[PDB]
Design a protein around this ligand. Structure first.
Ligand SMILES: [Ca+2]
Ligand SMILES: [Ca+2]
Ligand SMILES: [Ca+2]
Ligand SMILES: [Ca+2]
Ligand SMILES: [Zn+2]
Ligand SMILES: [Zn+2]
Lengths: 36, 367, 33, 39
């Protein structure tokens, strides 16, 4: 018996996983001076 | 680790590969080498061998291609998917295609060919993506200059083929488990509001707004820091985090290593050369008093005066009763000092110099 | 004949979205006197 | 003599590569004023 044909393609590949949450922003400079 | 579905493997122990075409990104030799070396990481831990035939049909055809290329899995241009490989088998079987649209390098720059190749070749031998974040077989490109198989990749690959005939027997780095007693630390810092604990080439990110501990390669944020840190402390005043490794340190401003590091600790701080390294460190809330622990003695540095304080080689066992003889890590949070040694964490009270609460090192997590 | 070539590999998956941006740094300290 | 049937499907394409670290957030607000100086 003659060899058959190839099967279809494997199902889609999984979506890639999300990324790592970015690092927190830099702390704000200190407030202004005080009212004498 | 995960063995590809269907358990594809090669029947022939002596394989051959071929670099069909080349990328105009790196000199043909740097590529031959990069691939040569990569194939070695796998053969180093198995009975397998990888010979390179310069023409004809090889068991693994390596090529560089763009977008669509007669193979069902088109590339996405720059970024994202860097490459793919097919499980073992005849014809297209066991092949590797690198997304040419990428800038392939032989350095630290984005997309070091060697590091991306070692992964691909994992699929080419019969391995699939590992759920272990520290494995080479983890669907994520990270790179700290070095490229090795993690104990996980070694186990998985030897599950398919067996061990190297080498008499010594190679071993890889193991990944830490947040909730596992016996877990210990190298350094603990408070980078910007959160707290990051370090263990090997990994960090465990703890943030108040979120419930989960995040484990990952320290290289995610800082590729150029040295592997295996010794101490680390944040200095609010100058939004800086200093990491220590032996006789010198690195200053990081958020996500960027400052210009000029590493830098020796003796010149920058003033330690005796008898101190070959720092064991732990933490700096006062706002008083600018950084403490560096060295074995059973500690030093206090005045951040503002940029110089040590009056005769400070003091014993820890005095100004800090109880805590112990050695410190692995330390950090200040809520006016309290949390000392870490071995598996125990002490909640030291600076105000009344008293050990308030002994507790598990991993206690700070959700276990 | 042979019930045959197993068939080609399915296509690779999309790349995952970037990582969410981090929070806005803690407010500054109360200025000097 | 007769041509055999079709082979099985195909291996599922490999998963997608992971995302990319997030940008670090923006700096915070400036702090509140400071206590009164001289009278
Ligand atoms: Ca092949
Ligand atoms: Ca790409
Ligand atoms: Ca290119
Ligand atoms: Ca340490
Ligand atoms: Zn391809
Ligand atoms: Zn992969």
């Amino acid at each position: 018996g003659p060899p058959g044909p190839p099967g279809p393609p494997g199902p889609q590949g999984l979506a890639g996983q999300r990324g790592i949450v970015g690092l927190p922003g830099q702390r704000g400079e200190r407030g202004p001076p005080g009212p004498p | 680790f995960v063995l590809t579905e269907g358990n594809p493997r090669w029947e022939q122990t002596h394989l051959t590969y071929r670099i069909e075409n080349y990328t105009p990104d790196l000199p043909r030799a740097d590529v031959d080498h990069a691939i040569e070396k990569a194939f070695q990481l796998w053969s180093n831990v198995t009975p397998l061998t990888f010979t390179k035939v310069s023409e004809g049909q090889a068991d693994i055809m390596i090529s560089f291609v763009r977008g669509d290329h007669r193979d069902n899995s088109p590339f996405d241009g720059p970024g994202g998917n860097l490459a793919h490989a097919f499980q073992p088998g005849p014809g297209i079987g066991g092949d590797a295609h690198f997304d040419e649209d990428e800038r392939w390098t032989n350095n630290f720059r984005e997309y070091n060919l060697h590091r991306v190749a070692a992964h691909a070749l994992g699929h080419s031998l019969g391995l699939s993506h590992s759920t272990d974040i520290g494995a080479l077989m983890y669907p994520s490109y990270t790179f700290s200059g070095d490229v090795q198989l993690a104990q996980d990749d070694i186990d998985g690959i030897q599950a398919i083929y067996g061990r190297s005939q080498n008499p010594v027997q190679p071993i890889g780095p193991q990944t830490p488990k947040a909730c596992d007693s016996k877990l210990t630390f190298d350094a603990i810092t408070t980078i910007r509001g959160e707290v990051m604990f370090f263990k090997d080439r990994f960090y465990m990110r703890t943030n108040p707004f979120y419930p989960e501990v995040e484990l990952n390669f320290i290289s995610v944020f800082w590729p150029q820091l040295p592997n295996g840190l010794e101490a680390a402390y944040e200095f609010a005043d100058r939004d800086e985090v200093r990491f220590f490794k032996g006789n010198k340190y690195w200053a990081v401003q958020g996500q960027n290593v400052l210009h000029g590091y590493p830098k020796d600790i003796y010149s920058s701080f003033g330690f005796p050369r008898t101190v070959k390294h720092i064991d732990a460190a933490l700096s006062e809330e706002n008083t600018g008093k950084t403490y560096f622990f060295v074995a059973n003695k500690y030093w206090r540095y005045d951040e503002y005066k940029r110089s040590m304080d009056p005769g400070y080689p003091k014993m820890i066992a005095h100004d800090f009763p109880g805590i112990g003889h050695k410190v692995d890590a330390v950090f200040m949070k809520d006016g309290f000092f949390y000392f870490f040694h071995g598996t125990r964490q002490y909640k030291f009270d600076p105000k009344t110099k008293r050990i308030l609460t002994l507790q598990k090192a991993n206690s700070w997590f959700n276990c």
